[PDB]
């Protein structure tokens, strides 16, 4: 019996609303993707199928798809078989083109997907009548890129779903793509989850999604009344209202009416410090984030240290650009085994994260868990326990028992508690 239902909103198209009262942490829907792929930077770093990092085995035919195990390579074959001949034949396509290829193959060759239970690819919003000419030109180039990439497998409309229009399909992709994140909150893939696509956006949402490999869990993060619309935040929380406005216009074709956008909620705190410094850090973050997307941790760390410990002027840790640098440095340190330095950066992020991730947000839950884990392994048992319990309080809501990371957290809590009891 579903706790959610599709409905027609007054001014935001279709949406999802609660059928029953919902409490924080309640699992509302779970879904595998209709189609998904690894993102360009994680290609060859994580398994194409399960999206875990490993030391990967490549598909011998295309040598593009890479896998953690024979199980994953073999299980991925039915959904990889047709794209394999295309990847071989061609130059690597934009993620959206690889994704749409997988959409087409799934719709043509696969049984009806549970991911389409509430809403299908065919139903998705295209926003075509809101696209500006520059966006239409970009979509036309994507169409032509798809036609080139897919030519070994799709030569005519007979090989697309009935009356499938590639321009419209890419228009849907742009406003319906989910960024799949691994357990550590590294972006690793992109997917379409058409039932989940019913959720409209809020900058202060009542639900949240989290990924466990390709699998998506939708949970309430506030109390929700019968009939109330369910929302998620499509965006990183570490964004000003101007940045949100740009992304919601450019990618989603809407103007956000939430209270936060009307009042520039938190913008001024997010932009504290000297503007010339944070403008330079924001510019450096383009390169830092590009390096991070490719798992280049040593280079990430070097760039971050040059900011965090700059000889030149510095930023407060609440400035969002400084905060993003701290977080990249922490993750680089964790992945590099520099656990004392990781804890220094991670600890600094804790109060800004408390402010910018109000309520229960999976990114804060994960960050607090990382900090608690670092403290636990440094023997700081009471401090680790407070953070691990805080992470559990958040992650019971945002992740829940169905997400494997919660089991890892429970292990840390038991280890930490055992230490405290032996002290
Ligand atoms: N610095 C890395 C980072 C990792 C994780 C997050 S997150 O967990 O907060 N989060 C991921 C999911 C994303 N949302 C989507 O991709 C998305 C797409 C849509 C609908 C289909 C348009 O709804 N959510 C919104 C940000 C933020 C930054
Ligand atoms: C993932 S879909 C959400 C479901 C969509 N309303 C539909 O009818 O299919 C994203 C699109 O929904 C609309 N949208 C989402 N959140 C909105 C909001 N807060 N205000 C207005 N439109 C919104 C925009 O058209 C956006 O591109
Ligand atoms: Mg429509
Ligand atoms: Mg419309
Ligand atoms: Zn795998
Ligand atoms: Zn292959
Ligand atoms: Zn808003």
Curated annotation (Swiss-Prot):
GO cellular component: cytosol; nucleoplasm; nucleus
Pfam families: SET, zf-MYND
Domain of life: Eukaryota
Biological role: Histone methyltransferase. Specifically methylates 'Lys-4' of histone H3, inducing di- and tri-methylation, but not monomethylation. Also methylates 'Lys-5' of histone H4. Plays an important role in transcriptional activation as a member of an RNA polymerase complex. Binds DNA containing 5'-CCCTCC-3' or 5'-GAGGGG-3' sequences.
Name of this protein: Histone-lysine N-methyltransferase SMYD3
Mapped zinc finger ranges (MYND-type): 47-84
This protein's UniProt keywords: Acetylation, Chromatin regulator, Cytoplasm, Metal-binding, Methyltransferase, Nucleus, Phosphoprotein, S-adenosyl-L-methionine, Transferase, Zinc, Zinc-finger
Top enzyme category: transferase
Binding site for S-adenosyl-L-methionine: 12-14, 119, 127, 176, 200-201, 234, 254
UniProt record, GO biological process: cellular response to dexamethasone stimulus; establishment of protein localization; methylation; myotube cell development; nucleosome assembly; positive regulation of transcription by RNA polymerase II
Regulation: Histone methyltransferase activity strongly stimulated by HSPCA.
Oligomeric and partner information: Interacts with HSPCA. Interacts with HELZ. Interacts with POLR2A; the interaction may be indirect and may be mediated by HELZ. Interacts with HSP90AA1; this interaction enhances SMYD3 histone-lysine N-methyltransferase.
Residue ranges constituting the SET domain according to the UniProt record: 2-235
Family in the record: Belongs to the class V-like SAM-binding methyltransferase superfamily. Histone-lysine methyltransferase family.
Principal location class: cytoplasm
Region of interest (C-terminal domain), residue spans: 267-423
EC number(s) given by UniProt: 2.1.1.354
Tissue: Expressed in skeletal muscles and testis. Overexpressed in a majority of colorectal and hepatocellular carcinomas.
Residues bearing PTM Phosphothreonine: 20
Annotated positions binding Zn(2+) 1: 47, 50, 68, 72
Localisation: Cytoplasm; Nucleus
